[PDB]
Each structure stands twice: as structure tokens, then as C-alpha cells.
Amino acid sequence: QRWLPLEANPEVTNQFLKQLGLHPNWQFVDVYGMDPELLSMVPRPVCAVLLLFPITEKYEVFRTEEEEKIKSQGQDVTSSVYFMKQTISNACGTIGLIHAIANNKDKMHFESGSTLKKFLEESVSMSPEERARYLENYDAIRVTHETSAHEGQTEAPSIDEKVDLHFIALVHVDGHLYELDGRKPFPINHGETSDETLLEDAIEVCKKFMERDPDELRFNAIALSAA
């Protein structure tokens, strides 16, 4: 099973969330730069950052080493984190948005018959792999993703084209900053954060991605900001 990749565009992501029946208390905005002046233009509070980055060979050796270190050495992951695996080529757009909403459920309002509300209620007790198989089979979100992939300032590529760009979500749960990437076997704990400092703390993780791949420009960050 193979979906179309989504454009890193707040207009597209906000339209997608509206189709999934989220009330617009929260809206995505662009992040223009990582210094205080440009970050001061992001409306506060912020409850998530989605980062688009390139899956290069250099990225993949770091991902391999990180996975091996955490499997053998351990890390803390709070039981409150909602995590799902990616089992569908090019669904990272949808999985990133579900990670952002599912880990802020208490701050979110849903409309009558919200498909995302139904997805979250049914998957509340599922393992990360079961959540991934459930999404494979969840037609209402598959057809909404399909429509959304045709929106934006660029044309959707052919479904056969290889995609080397990937979305991840950065959230605050229970005092800590989690990287949620369906391609990894677990959340990644990036240390302490709070509701008031999430944007700054998330952007510090994004900076580390860019420094590990210094010759790449193919990055985009969107912040989920109070409307």
C-alpha cells in the first residue's frame, strides 16, 4: 500500500485537519528561521512542530546507531505517549498529524462525526503496530489524505516516484520532548521541556538534524499554534 506525499504547507495541513473534523482552536504556521527574532513571529502557545527533512545515507547511519544504542542501553518513555508505526509508503504526512493531535487530545475539540476523533477513540488501547495496521485499513483518512496530496502550490508527483523526504512530530508529553517517527521502533526522548518552551526546545532538535547533514537545504518546519 502506497499513498501520495503531502506538501509542507500550513494551508494544506489546516484544510486536512478541518476535513478530519478538528475544531480550529489550533492552526499550523510556517517557521521562517530558528533565531529568536523569526521564532517570535510564531503565535504562542505552540503544542507541536512537524519537521520535513531528507533521508540521506548520512541520516540513515545515525538512525541505525541511535536505534542500536536505545535498544541495548534503554531510555524513559512515559506511558501517556501515543505512538504508531509507519507500514505505508508516503503516509508520514498523516502519521505526523495524528501524532500531533493524539498527544494534545486534552487541548483539542472535535465536531460531530469527526473521523479523527473515531480513529483516536478506537486506537486508544492498540499497540503501535496495531495502530499502523488500523490506519492501513482506515478508508475515511486514506481518501482525505489522497485529496490533501493534490492541494498546495506544487503538483502531486506520480505514485511510483521514490520519496527521500520525511515528516516527524515533536511534542511535549509529561515534562519531556518526544520525537515521534513511525519509521523508528519507539518514540525518542530528547529530554526535559514544558508547554511554555516547546517551540524553542523542538527547534533545538531540528538544528541537530541540520548540523548532522550540513550540505542539505531540504528542511521545513511548521508549528501548531493557538488560533
Binding site: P5, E7, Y32, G93, A156, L165, E216, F219, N220
Partner: protein, 76 residues
């Protein structure tokens, strides 16, 4: 005249331009230097998103002004 274009990574691209140059022209110059297709480019100056058909002059972009580049990339 010289202008600066900063990316989200904080990299600075220097362009040689005229006040009469269109936003399309600037995007073509960025494609020439960095190989980013114009359709994926979104340029900002003074917190305002710029339109393709307008000139640097229209926006009072002058010598050594800094613009911001956001990339409308697609991700899986």
C-alpha cells in the same frame, strides 16, 4: 546590487539583482545557484509573502536587504 536570502537552515544565498527584477527572476537565480525549482520556493520580506509578478522595487527591497526562503517540499 547584492541581496541576501536566508534558508530555515540559516544558510545565506547572495544574489546579484536589479530593483526592476521580478520575484520570478529571483527564484530563477536561486534555482541557478542552489538547484531548488521555483514552484517549491516561497519568499518572505519584512514578514510579508512576496508575489511572482511584482518587482524588488515594489517591496522596497534595497542593497543588502535579507529575504527568507521557505521550501514547499513534499514528504512521505
Amino acid at each position: 546590487l547584492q541581496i541576501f536570502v536566508k534558508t530555515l537552515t540559516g544558510k545565506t544565498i547572495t544574489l546579484e539583482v536589479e530593483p526592476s527584477d521580478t520575484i520570478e527572476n529571483v527564484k530563477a537565480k536561486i534555482q541557478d545557484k542552489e538547484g531548488i525549482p521555483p514552484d517549491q520556493q516561497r519568499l518572505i520580506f519584512a514578514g510579508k509573502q512576496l508575489e511572482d509578478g511584482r518587482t524588488l522595487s515594489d517591496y522596497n527591497i534595497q542593497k543588502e536587504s535579507t529575504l527568507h526562503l521557505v521550501l514547499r517540499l513534499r514528504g512521505g
